[PDB]
Design a protein around this ligand. Sequence first.
Ligand SMILES: C[S@@+](CC[C@H](N)C(=O)[O-])C[C@H]1O[C@@H](n2cnc3c(N)ncnc32)[C@H](O)[C@@H]1O
Length: 340
Amino acid sequence: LEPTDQDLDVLLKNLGNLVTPMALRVAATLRLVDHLLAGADTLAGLADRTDTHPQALSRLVRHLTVVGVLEGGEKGRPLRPTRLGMLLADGHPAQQRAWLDLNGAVSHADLAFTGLLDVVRTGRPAYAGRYGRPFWEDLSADVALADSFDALMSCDEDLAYEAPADAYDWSAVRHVLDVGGGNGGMLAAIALRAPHLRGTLVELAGPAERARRRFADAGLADRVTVAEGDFFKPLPVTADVVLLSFVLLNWSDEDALTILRGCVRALEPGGRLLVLDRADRFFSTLLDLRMLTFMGGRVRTRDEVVDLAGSAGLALASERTSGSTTLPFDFSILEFTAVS
Ligand SMILES: C[S@@+](CC[C@H](N)C(=O)[O-])C[C@H]1O[C@@H](n2cnc3c(N)ncnc32)[C@H](O)[C@@H]1O
């Protein structure tokens, strides 16, 4: 095959273009579009409001103009965002300004993509190599990253867990061990549906503190407790139900296996281990690479989790996938028993 000039152009402006996406991130981070919409319409004006180097900013601004994010400033027209540029306004529902915000977790993490070669070579995430510690430990210690990461996820919404909680019968369930339960959304929805149910959530300090508050707010502290812990170490209690809610997808096959082995060990005899997890092609592969690059994990298909569970001494007992009005993706609950 012989590449056309159009192929070359698309490679240079788009696919191989690492400059423009950083310009967008700098643009979002500086609230450039917001400052323009609030009245700034000159370079010195924007520079003054962003505390940026006037000449350097003009250069970012020329680029942003060529690529279609800003317009005007014809060297006597007024500097302004384009229709596309309006995506960076603070309140657009697509939250693109938050996604690109270098202060935010996702964009911050995206920068670790400069270590992608090593990621493809070793299968290991680049995040720690860039920032000093692994993704979740970083988010745990830094509330701005944690909250910013959470704010962009549908799981963080008010009714996020109603449907999955609705999908399983908790009536006879006595004690749920919620491994890496985050701020406790699933556990709370469960505890509310099952008044006699007790719960134990194991988490890093950051999310543990937020889960404590969620449980208190809900009148659940009497029966749902929070334990700060490392789910790579032996779990602190046993339970007739062990829950992994959107946890496995964050880990490599190897790390996910060590987590499950840990869960099987805390699972009381006869108990149930539950894994709740789960154009078009572009977005899944994007997500997949972020997951790999950020934390060493991946979205696994059903069978893949089944085989992984099988290697942890678990056998599939039942499976259910369903949709929600809240989530942009259907969810699924894999229910396992100890095969021994
Ligand atoms: C997808 S997030 C939250 C998952 C949550 N159960 C839910 O329903 O969304 C994954 C969680 O695993 C937690 N985590 C990561 N490493 C951990 C570890 N070593 N010990 C405990 N929790 C950990 C993170 O703090 C994060 O809250």
